[PDB]
Design a protein around this ligand. Structure first.
Ligand SMILES: *[C@@H]1O[C@H](CO)[C@@H](O[C@@H]2O[C@H](CO)[C@@H](O[C@@H]3O[C@H](CO)[C@@H](O)[C@H](O)[C@@H]3O)[C@H](O)[C@H]2NC(C)=O)[C@H](O)[C@H]1NC(C)=O
Ligand SMILES: *[C@@H]1O[C@H](CO)[C@@H](O[C@@H]2O[C@H](CO)[C@@H](O[C@@H]3O[C@H](CO)[C@@H](O)[C@H](O)[C@@H]3O)[C@H](O)[C@H]2NC(C)=O)[C@H](O)[C@H]1NC(C)=O
Ligand SMILES: *[C@@H]1O[C@H](CO)[C@@H](O[C@@H]2O[C@H](CO)[C@@H](O)[C@H](O)[C@H]2NC(C)=O)[C@H](O)[C@H]1NC(C)=O
Ligand code: NAG
Ligand code: NAG
Ligand code: NAG
Lengths: 57, 172, 57
């Protein structure tokens, strides 16, 4: 059930450019951190609910 | 001084956390060095910035410049320089024989061309003139080429730009 | 265009700078020049799409 992500911003750099490049790196890092926390929380919730479901059953 | 894109130069410098200035023997010939300003006082005498070298006419002339500085070793080299925006036409002629001197600092990857514009800015600390601070970073294997016909404030060396964990903040 | 003695790469010092102008339907494109012009031979069909770019090996 993935979603299309055809076009995105450039996420790798080989030069120092200034404030816009730093902003792009910052938004990339914030998105990655938020999605990592979301994934960890989702896995923990699903594991807890599965372990409790297969015990209440 | 006023720095075009100041918020980017500040972040670029603050991310390295190193002020290891290394003097390099440049090829400034035919012009006088060590310009003197009265608003800058060091040791109760007129002075100027230590890192930036303010060049001026020598013997009522200012020959065009073409200097180069290759980067051999395996680290980047950051050059901080600037361009002087004078107050009036008289203040431009008194310092340089050229009234509208172009400047051009080029690496192999890209170039920067700047035209100083004369203008009567409001006086701050009893001086109307301004300077604009730029910066060029040289990758390993590239060379830095500086060409100028006036209004040049050259570097004395280079800063050791490197990746690091440093940062900047504003507090009291 | 600004004349300048850039370092020689492939034994040529000169450079070219590439721009781009997009014309909407109903508009016209007008080109005026007095020198240093590198003109187009035609136009590219810019359109919305799902394409993308990437850098790999
Ligand atoms: C253009 O207009 C500006 C703004 O009015 C003028 O700048 C101001 O000029 C006055 C007169 O020179 C300055 O006041 C006095 O200046 C001298 C400095 O040598 C001195 O007698 C006094 O200490 C006093 O400061 C004033 O500072 C200056 N700036 C401002 C912000 O008011 C300017 O002179 C006009 N003309 C030209 C040709 O630029
Ligand atoms: C301004 O300074 C630059 C940098 O030093 C000079 O560019 C370099 O000029 C030399 C001498 O022409 C070039 O080396 C030789 O060039 C010719 C090419 O026809 C040929 O004899 C050799 O194959 C050799 O390459 C050199 O490539 C060139 N570039 C660099 C990056 O060093 C420039 O000539 C100076 N003067 C002017 C007026 O631009
Ligand atoms: C640096 O580039 C400048 C132009 O930006 C060159 O200056 C020219 O030099 C020639 C040769 O003396 C003069 O006839 C021209 O009038 C100059 N033009 C300008 C606009 O100043 C200069 O040649 C380059 N430097 C060197 C050392 O070659
Ligand atoms: C320095 O600049 C002058 C300019 O005339 C040039 O002739 C000379 O070769 C350069 N290098 C040295 C080491 O003097
Ligand atoms: C300019 O001042 C510096 C620093 O004091 C000195 O090393 C240099 O020799 C001076 N150059 C000239 C041309 O006076
Ligand atoms: C300055 O240039 C003039 C005109 O060529 C010459 O007579 C004089 O000797 C020069 N002075 C110096 C200090 O080079």
């Amino acid at each position: 059930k993935t979603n299309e992500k055809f076009h995105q911003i450039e996420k790798e750099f080989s030069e120092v450019e200034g404030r816009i490049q730093d902003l792009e790196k910052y938004v990339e890092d914030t998105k990655i951190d938020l999605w990592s926390y979301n994934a960890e929380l989702l896995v923990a919730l699903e594991n807890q609910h599965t372990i409790d479901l297969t015990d209440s059953e | 001084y006023d720095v075009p894109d100041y918020a980017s130069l500040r972040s670029l410098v603050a991310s390295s956390g190193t002020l290891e200035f290394k003097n390099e023997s440049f090829n400034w010939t035919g012009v006088t060095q060590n310009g003197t300003s009265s608003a800058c006082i060091r040791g109760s005498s007129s002075s100027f910035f230590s890192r930036l070298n303010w060049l001026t006419h020598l013997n009522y002339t200012y020959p065009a410049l073409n200097v180069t500085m290759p980067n051999n070793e395996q680290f980047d080299k950051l050059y901080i320089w600037g361009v002087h925006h004078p107050g009036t036409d008289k203040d431009q002629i008194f310092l340089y024989a050229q009234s509208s001197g172009r400047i051009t600092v080029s690496t192999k990857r890209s170039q920067q061309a700047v035209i100083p514009n004369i203008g009567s800015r409001p006086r701050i600390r009893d001086i109307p003139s301004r300077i604009s601070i730029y910066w060029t970073i040289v990758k390993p294997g590239d060379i830095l080429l500086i060409n100028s016909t006036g209004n040049l404030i050259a570097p004395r060396g280079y800063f050791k730009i490197r990746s690091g964990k440093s940062s900047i903040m504003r507090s009291d």
